Amino acid sequence: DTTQVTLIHKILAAADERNLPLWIGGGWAIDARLGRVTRKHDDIDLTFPGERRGELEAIVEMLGGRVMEELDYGFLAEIGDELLDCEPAWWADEAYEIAEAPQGSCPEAAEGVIAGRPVRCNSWEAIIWDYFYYADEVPPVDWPTKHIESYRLACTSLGAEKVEVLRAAFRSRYAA
Numbered sequence: 001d002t003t004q005v006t007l008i009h010k011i012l013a014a015a016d017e018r019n020l021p022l023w024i025g026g027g028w029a030i031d032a033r034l035g036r037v038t039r040k041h042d043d044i045d046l047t048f049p050g051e052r053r054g055e056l057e058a059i060v061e062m063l064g065g066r067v068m069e070e071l072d073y074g075f076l077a078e079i080g081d082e083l084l085d086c087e088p089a090w091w092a093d094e095a096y097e098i099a100e101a102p103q104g105s106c107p108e109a110a111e112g113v114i115a116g117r118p119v120r121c122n123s124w125e126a127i128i129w130d131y132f133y134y135a136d137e138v139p140p141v142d143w144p145t146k147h148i149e150s151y152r153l154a155c156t157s158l159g160a161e162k163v164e165v166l167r168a169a170f171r172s173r174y175a176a
């Protein structure tokens with residue numbers, strides 16, 4: 001909705017002012033890379049420089065929100081009725097990287113668009129990688145249609161063959 005889109009704009013405007021890079025992830029990242037809103041989104045997934053967490057928290061608080069909960073992978077924040085699902089990325093040689101994700105997870109270039117404005121967003125590979133973790137908890141056939149359709153859309157955008165090679169790499173990484 002306009003509330004989320006406006007909120008995304010406000011968060012990134014504030015981050016830009018501090019030269020704080022933030023990467024849109026998850027469902028909004030798919031829509032950003034496509035340059036098209038495809039459905040309603042339940043939250044906003046964000047990736048932030050882990051060593052600058054305080055700056056993202058300060059922006060959340062500046063916008064009238066609060067940190068709500070710590071997660072195994074990051075933290076949960078709330079601005080009004082909108083949920084922000086935040087994960088750190090850590091400096092790895094010459095770029096920020098999400099822990100355990102494929103290299104290039106956090107490109108410096110803005111490769112997506114939301115409401116006409118370029119935005120940084122996680123790579124297709126990083127977006128798809130998180131579905132592999134999900135598949136390991138819940139069989140894909142048992143996913144809500146939301147997740148099935150989002151997955152298939154991301155898959156088609158990147159290329160099915162690239163996805164199946166990536167999935168083989170995931171299986172190899174976590175094989176036991």
Ligand SMILES: NC[C@H]1O[C@H](O[C@H]2[C@H](O)[C@@H](O[C@H]3O[C@H](CO)[C@@H](O)[C@H](N)[C@H]3O)[C@H](N)C[C@@H]2N)[C@H](N)C[C@@H]1O
Pocket residue numbers: 026043045072073085086087098099100101130133134
């Ligand atoms: N990078 C390593 C991590 O990757 C994945 O986490 C991913 C989480 O599963 C993602 O969170 C998802 O799962 C959580 C519940 O775990 C939901 O609350 C949330 N809305 C949903 O988006 C979150 N938004 C991104 C994160 N990369 C793995 N599930 C855990 C792993 O430690």
Ligand SMILES: Nc1ncnc2c1ncn2[C@@H]1O[C@H](COP(=O)(O)CP(=O)(O)OP(=O)(O)O)[C@@H](O)[C@H]1O
Pocket residue numbers: 025026027028040041042043044045085127128129130131132133134135137147150
């Ligand atoms: N219980 C769970 N365990 C692990 N990964 C999960 C998960 N639930 C969701 N995920 C993964 O997290 C990513 C997206 O998470 P969610 O934010 O909950 C939905 P989404 O694709 O962002 O749509 P949305 O825009 O409506 O939020 C996908 O990779 C999905 O597979």
Ligand SMILES: [Mn+2]
Pocket residue numbers: 026027028041042043044045085
């Ligand atoms: Mn989401």
Ligand SMILES: [Mn+2]
Pocket residue numbers: 026043044045085
């Ligand atoms: Mn989420």
